[PDB]
Amino acid sequence: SQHMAFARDTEVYYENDTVPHMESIEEMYSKYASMNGELPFDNGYAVPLDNVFVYTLDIASGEIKKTRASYIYREKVEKLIEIKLSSGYSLKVTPSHPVLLFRDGLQWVPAAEVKPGDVVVGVRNGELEFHEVSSVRIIDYNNWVYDLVIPETHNFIAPNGLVLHNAQ
């Protein structure tokens, strides 16, 4: 099992107490490590979070809800999968990481099984949004990979709407 999933430049959205923030997951980790400290955890390090919340998607009902984030994790990884969207945006995640696609309806699919032509799923203005994949490949990454752990539902919604799953 793994507790890290996302490249360091993955943008996140969250609220601390009531105050919204958008920044990269490495920027978030640095901010809260300074504030809260780091705990050795698994094969890397974790920063505990107090009063931090995200938006999350229930894929069965389509309901968007608010739920807490428990901690941010990081560990170094050699190789990631880069899923590039026709927009030029790229999702860079570990190869087994579940990615939300629309195939036979909404389905979580391991990143390395995502194909050009698949549609990655996000939600915006309450509605599902579909983004065609332009290319996939393994990349040499060799750096910190992160997760923002969401215990209730195991996903958080990024600023661009993509529904990002926690590491497994």
**Number of domains within the chain:** 1
| Domain ranges, residue 61 | 1-168
Q: Tokens at residue 15, please?
A: 């609220």
Q: Residue 129, class by beta-carbon neighbours within 10 Å (0-12 exposed, 13-18 middle, 19+ buried)?
A: middle
9 CB neighbour count, 10 Å cutoff? 13
Q: What is residue 149's three-state secondary structure? A: strand
R_g of the chain computed on alpha carbons: 15
**Experimental determination approach used:** X-ray
**CA atoms of 147 and 151, how far apart (whole Å):** 12
Q: 150, 167 in Cβ contact below 8 A?
A: no
Closest by Cα among 109, 84, 75, 85 to 95: 109
CB of 162 closer than 8 Å to CB of 25? no
Structure tokens at 58: 């229930």
| Residue 119 identity | V
In the chain the first and final C-alpha atoms are separated, in Å, by 6
Candidates 100, 5, 87, 19; CA nearest to 56 is 100
The CATH number assigned to the domain holding 76 equals 2.170.16.10
Residue for token pair 């661009």: 160
Paired with 33 in beta bridges are: none
